[PDB]
Write a protein that binds this ligand. Sequence first.
Ligand SMILES: O=C(N[C@H]1CCCCCCC[C@@H]2C[C@@]2(C(=O)NS(=O)(=O)C2CC2)NC(=O)[C@@H]2C[C@@H](OC(=O)N3CCc4ccccc4C3)CN2C1=O)OC1CCCC1
Ligand SMILES: [Zn+2]
Lengths: 175, 13
Amino acid sequence: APITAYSQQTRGLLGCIITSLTGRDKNQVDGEVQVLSTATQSFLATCVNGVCWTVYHGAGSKTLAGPKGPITQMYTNVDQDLVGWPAPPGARSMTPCTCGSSDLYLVTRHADVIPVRRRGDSRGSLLSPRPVSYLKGSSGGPLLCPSGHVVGIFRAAVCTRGVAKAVDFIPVESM
Amino acid sequence: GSVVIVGRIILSG
Ligand SMILES: O=C(N[C@H]1CCCCCCC[C@@H]2C[C@@]2(C(=O)NS(=O)(=O)C2CC2)NC(=O)[C@@H]2C[C@@H](OC(=O)N3CCc4ccccc4C3)CN2C1=O)OC1CCCC1
Ligand SMILES: [Zn+2]
């Protein structure tokens, strides 16, 4: 699967503190994966079927800054560590996976696409182990099948003595 | 405060 990724920053920190306080986003949203930030931590979101989905341990119950004001969380499932907002116009939704393939590809905030082997509903193993510091801030990022459809979003790193060896994720069916 | 879209990840292939 020749899946690649490229990260584009659309905002600085000053513009982030300001847009955070107001709740009003002037910018035009594009893409399927969004890079999110509260002023103090940064993580990912994936738009699937109308909703911008991310992790609770990242977003909390916070509103998302939108074109015409703060967008309230329509969906919150603390049991699953999942939140969603209705996607702002411009944010294209990804197509949920069909092939039921077990060969997955995790997209990180650093625009890398990591091969992952599915082990259960919520579990896949990293074919190559990764440093913990390398994966931090990538929760909410999608796991894609070889054709390129969403099977879930990254939730937690499964570690073996300080090094990530597997990923735990929220399946698409859960959303 | 709100959560803010500060960037995006463009996918390909
Ligand atoms: O607890 C962990 N592992 C920790 C390891 C922490 C070290 C940092 C690893 C790095 C990468 C990892 C994706 C990530 C992250 O980047 N978060 S972030 O920086 O974007 C943050 C938003 C700003 N999530 C994490 O850091 C999670 C958060 C915390 O776990 C949760 O809050 N979970 C644990 C998973 C889970 C599963 C079911 C229901 C609720 C929950 C809630 C520990 N974590 C973890 O991932 O693994 C358990 C749970 C699943 C299998 C065993
Ligand atoms: Zn598929």
